[model samples]
Target: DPDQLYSTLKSILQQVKSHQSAWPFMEPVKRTEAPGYYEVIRFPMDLKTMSERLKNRYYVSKKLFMADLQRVFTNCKEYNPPESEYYKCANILEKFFFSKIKEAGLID
Candidate 1:
């Protein structure tokens, strides 16, 4: 998987010029005495991590959680969902994304 990781990093680096905001990825990893210190470093604060962080930072009421899920869903899909109805599509997507990060074990 290290190969895939390097390939992904390479692909991301290739696009870095176009995505100026992602410049931090360009920084070279420093070698250290610790084993695997130079291994691919995954983003620690992806969507799910951010969600958990948010929950810890604020009192995450069901209403607020649903609101967050709704925004996430509306941005990625079903943008034309009825404006008046409560939407569940985004919550589903957010859950899936969160599950993926957990499965990948990329977040602590």
Candidate 2:
């Protein structure tokens, strides 16, 4: 099915970016601000990174886009403790995108 995948994902991403809990993920985590982030997170990702990936044609498939979004959530979990605000934000945002992608028919 030709679902116009890029635009579909872009729409979902826009929603995620504007979501209330999206502040922590709006930009890349700075190495200087938080040491050991790179050590723990092998591949950091964020909304800014994702939008660029979308704009530059870096995402050839929905799977890659999903993975990067997944990475964003996972990195937050790994970097922040479960009781922290960031961890909770990741949980909410991750859940939001999962349902969205399902609605978009990108996943089952």
Candidate 3:
């Protein structure tokens, strides 16, 4: 219950963000970044907010962490097109996320 929980979650987040396709999720999409973002997208999630959530000690088990984790891609697909590079990145990131989650279980 100490920092182990914090440590593992951060490790997973780190792995996810470091991916080459991770650029889109690196920061929250601004209205300046993409016009009509607020009106089209009902919910927003990204790497920075997840990190902030972690910092705020909002994570419990990995289960809850992953709930919001998937939200990133969920919103991504909802906004981006199926043929777009941004959508492709979310797909790749999902694969990498699960891979690291498996690693986390084996690491300890």
What do the candidate models score in CA lDDT, each in turn?
Answer: 0.36, 0.87, 0.87
Query: Which ranges in model 1 have alpha carbons more than 4 Å from their true place?
Result: 1-46, 78-108
Per-residue lDDT of model 3, residues 5-101, tens digit only: 8998988898888889999999899889889988987878899999999998898677778888899999999999899999999999999998888
Candidates in descending lDDT order: 3, 2, 1
lDDT of 3 at 51: 93
For residue 108, what is the lDDT in candidate 2? 20
lDDT digits (tens) for residues 1-108 of candidate 2? 334766887899999999999999999998787887888888899999999989887777877888899999989998899999999999999888888888877752
Ranking by TM-score: 3, 2, 1
Predicted candidate 1 versus true structure: per-residue lDDT over 44-107, tens digit per residue: 1123432343436431233443344344444433322444222343344446545543544442
